[PDB]
Design a protein around this ligand. Structure first.
Ligand SMILES: Cc1nc(=O)c2cc(CN(C)c3ccc(C(=O)N[C@@H](CCC(=O)O)C(=O)O)s3)ccc2[nH]1
Ligand SMILES: Cc1nc(=O)c2cc(CN(C)c3ccc(C(=O)N[C@@H](CCC(=O)O)C(=O)O)s3)ccc2[nH]1
Ligand SMILES: O=c1[nH]c(=O)n([C@H]2C[C@H](O)[C@@H](COP(=O)(O)O)O2)cc1F
Ligand SMILES: O=c1[nH]c(=O)n([C@H]2C[C@H](O)[C@@H](COP(=O)(O)O)O2)cc1F
Lengths: 288, 288
């Protein structure tokens, strides 16, 4: 059976061979394709890429950060994960005309939309308990009890909240699905930085699916990744060309180390990736 | 070059051959597959299906209805199109809890979220002039001023408005994309009745692409249809086996008969389908 990672790389080779040139907001420029889909089995494997070393600690920490509802970049930075610091910096904030905003404050982004969709956002430090829809919880409840439901969706695209956010969410909505005691997730990623964001994003929603499978007594099934604008930034082409030449290695496995009963009780120590020996890291310059 | 229609039929064959048996809200039963994508070209063809007659007037009147921002089945029925009536009727309203709602009042459905996302829904006869977000206008604006934008997005999934609607939307979101003067559109459909809904839906969003292309100066490109739960109801397996035997005739054409400027200007007579020569219609009864 072909390797899970070939979905990703074929998407790469596809964009390199057939992407069209197209300008982007950042000035960098891209080769791009509109609409793609990739299926990654979660069954006795976890799709953390092997053709380059993906920042696992960053994946797990980012997710726990969304779970607890945080729109504070500093809560994440302090766990040693820097990935949102630039989006929360004073300068970046000034550039979007948020001179009045405390730094680290990303606006009403992922964690907020996941746990409080509809609440009126004030700042990153306010308490929102009982405000808006706890979409993440409504998903776990439907799955436990009415698993055949075709509406198990969590959406972060809030048009009322877009003008306040430091970055409009790129993983806009996702849907869970249950058959034969398997929990599958599909992600609509409106915009996908193939070299940098994407491999991370696959680990992210793969993991979310493991967590949710765990607390609901289901076995993980498929992760289905759908992209809108799938782009390779021009400065990523050489590094990616390098990446392609590597033979993929067995995907690692994921061990959840104890019985956890609520999603919010999960802590970093509960997760152990075993058997991960990726090829060496590949730096891609992030466009700003 | 294979016929675009072979994408639709291919998905039916895939479901029938590989779908897992899955229960549904209506107790009808289905054959289900989670996560699919198809790409219909819109260049010098319009993907109205030929392997059975698609109710085109219905497509056209339903879209103008959504554009008008209407949420009243009667304003669509009066134009000879009855597809939303069961959902807007007294008994059905009461069944859902809306003792209080005037007959025809579907709640805050597609038209509302497209035109006035965020506004507190009153009833169907209300005026919502400048009251929530106008996702539709914004999409056209963004295509005109900044075509390269990776956030050209329309969303009907408002978790708050959900418990007020007759049927949570299947057209959960769509994204528009521009490159080399070509406009494309990707629809995310969380739930597809492959027999009844889907062929209608393909036409629907293909039309909207042709409209927005017309008032933005663009040639239409691809429509990408992505699927959440792609099902065939059990009492559709037979009509569809009949349907798979017919050989598709060349897709028809569509012409916009006059230069129109705003999206609201469009009227049913602005559109002519040329060359639509379908096989005889097959009735698929709607599961309830
Ligand atoms: C143009 C752009 N592309 C992105 O991929 C992107 C990603 C994020 C946030 N995000 C979802 C990220 C996931 C991983 C990331 C990253 O830069 N990590 C480096 C390693 C950094 C480290 O080791 O500390 C990497 O994966 O190479 S950034 C924010 C803005 C963006 N902007
Ligand atoms: C379970 C279910 N499946 C659906 O496909 C569906 C579709 C709609 C709305 N919709 C998107 C529809 C599109 C087309 C329709 C229909 O019934 N068409 C007939 C009318 C033709 C005629 O008599 O002239 C048909 O296709 O034959 S209904 C509403 C609830 C649903 N419910
Ligand atoms: O999780 C993410 N994944 C990702 O690929 N991006 C990239 C895609 C794009 O390159 C940029 C967002 O840019 P835009 O808003 O112009 O689509 O970030 C961002 C994330 F947060
Ligand atoms: O445009 C549509 N297309 C469609 O396929 N459905 C179908 C999908 C499903 O069979 C049912 C909705 O039920 P659920 O909400 O349980 O998915 O209606 C409804 C529409 F309005």
């Amino acid at each position: 059976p072909p390797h899970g990672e070939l979905q990703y790389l074929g998407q790469i080779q596809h964009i390199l061979r057939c992407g069209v040139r197209k300008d982007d907001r950042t000035g960098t420029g891209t080769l791009s394709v509109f609409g793609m889909q990739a299926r990654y089995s979660l069954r006795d494997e976890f799709p953390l890429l092997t053709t380059k070393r993906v920042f696992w600690k960053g994946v797990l920490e980012e997710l726990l950060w969304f779970i607890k509802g945080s729109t504070n970049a500093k809560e994440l930075s302090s766990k040693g994960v820097k990935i949102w610091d630039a989006n929360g910096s004073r300068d970046f904030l000034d550039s979007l005309g948020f001179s009045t905003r405390e730094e680290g404050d990303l606006g009403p982004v992922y964690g907020f939309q996941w746990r409080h969709f509809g609440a009126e956002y004030r700042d990153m430090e306010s308490d929102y308990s009982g405000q808006g829809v706890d979409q993440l919880q409504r998903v776990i409840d439907t799955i436990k009890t009415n698993p055949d439901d075709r509406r198990i969706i969590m959406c972060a695209w809030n048009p009322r909240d877009l003008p306040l956010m430091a970055l409009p969410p790129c993983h806009a909505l996702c849907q869970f699905y249950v058959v034969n005691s398997e929990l599958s997730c599909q992600l609509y990623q409106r915009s996908g930085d193939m070299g940098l964001g994407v491999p991370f994003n696959i680990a992210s929603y793969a993991l979310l699916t493991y967590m949710i499978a765990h607390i609901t007594g289901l076995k993980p099934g498929d992760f289905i990744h759908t992209l809108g604008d799938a782009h390779i930034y021009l400065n990523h082409i050489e590094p990616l060309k390098i990446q392609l030449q590597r033979e993929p290695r067995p995907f690692p496995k994921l061990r959840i180390l104890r019985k956890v009963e609520k999603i919010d009780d999960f802590k970093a120590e509960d997760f152990q990736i075993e058997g991960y020996n990726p090829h060496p890291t590949i730096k891609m310059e992030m466009a700003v």
